[PDB]
Design a binder for this molecule. Structure first.
Ligand SMILES: COc1cc2cc(c1OC)OCCCn1cc(nn1)C[C@H](C)COC(=O)[C@@H]1CCCCN1C(=O)[C@H]2C1CCCCC1
Length: 128
């Protein structure tokens, strides 16, 4: 299903071309701007371990997930991936641990060396 599709077909959006962050655009967005470092960004998301065994969503809190891009408030893979997204876009990301929580992990939610999958909808972004 979705994570395997991203393995198979996604674009490697890493600078190092190490396949650490793979992307598919699932729904195309509007306009020419993409976020840049410093922007306040608003998303809805659905995440899970690519194994499938935990499944976290902004909708579980009935409100958008808000963060400042490139301020290390989210994992490196979000700073990289959301920077590529247009407003209204829905994208699938598949993320190696190097761009997420690494060999240390983040227990109890995230084990060591975890690959992560997200669907992200970019709702809006505003310049600091
Ligand atoms: C490692 O801890 C969590 C990881 C994740 C969600 C968490 C975590 O809290 C213990 O709580 C969800 C409550 C809302 N929320 C999200 C954040 N802050 N509050 C950003 C997090 C502090 C860091 O999260 C991230 O960088 C990414 C991207 C933004 C959305 C949440 N992220 C996660 O890694 C999720 C994770 C997704 C895979 C399945 C388990 C939860």
């Amino acid at each position: 299903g979705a994570p395997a599709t991203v393995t198979e077909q996604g674009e490697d959006i890493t600078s190092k071309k190490d396949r650490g962050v793979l992307k598919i655009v699932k729904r195309v967005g509007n306009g020419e701007e993409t976020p840049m470092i410093g922007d306040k960004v608003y998303v809805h998301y659905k995440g899970k371990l690519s194994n499938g065994k935990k499944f976290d969503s902004s909708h579980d809190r009935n409100e958008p997930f808000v963060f400042s891009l490139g301020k290390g408030q989210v994992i490196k893979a979000w700073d990289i991936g959301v920077a590529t997204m247009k407003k209204g876009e829905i994208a699938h990301l598949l993320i190696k641990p190097e761009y997420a929580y690494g060999s240390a992990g983040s227990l109890p939610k995230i084990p060591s060396n975890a690959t992560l999958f997200f669907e992200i909808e970019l709702l809006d972004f505003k310049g600091e």
